[PDB]
Amino acid sequence: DEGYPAEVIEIIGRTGTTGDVTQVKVRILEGRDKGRVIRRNVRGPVRIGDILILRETEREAREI
């Protein structure tokens, strides 16, 4: 559905086989679940306030 933007509001830490994926918490900006806070995995350099285009907002990343 062309993706859904969500804003990064908190960083948990690093994760992965080589510590490449950063776990963050994102609030959905638009969609049916607008404003919901979820925990999602991110690959690459990420800051606070970044906007990530998630294809779907169903699954939640596992805790560290």
Partner 1 sequence: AKPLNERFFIPHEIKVMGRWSTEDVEVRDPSLKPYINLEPRLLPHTHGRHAKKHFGKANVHIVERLINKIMRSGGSHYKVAGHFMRREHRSLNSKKVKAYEVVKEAFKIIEQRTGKNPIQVLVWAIENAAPREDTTSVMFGGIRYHVAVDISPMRRLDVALRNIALGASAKCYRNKMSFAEALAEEIILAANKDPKSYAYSKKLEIERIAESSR
* Binding residues vs partner 1 (CB under 8 A): 3, 5, 15-17, 20-21, 29, 40-47, 50-55, 59, 62
Q: Using the minimum distance from each CB to partner 1, give the nearer residue, 32 or 53.
A: 53
Q: Report in angstroms how near the CB of residue 49 gets to partner 1 at its nearest.
A: 8
Nearer to partner 1, 32 or 62 (CB): 62
Please state the closest distance from residue 32 (CB atom) to partner 1, in A. 18
> DSSP letters of the chain?
---EEEEEEEEEEEESSSS-EEEEEEEE-SSTTTT-EEEEEEES---TT-EEEES-S---PPP-
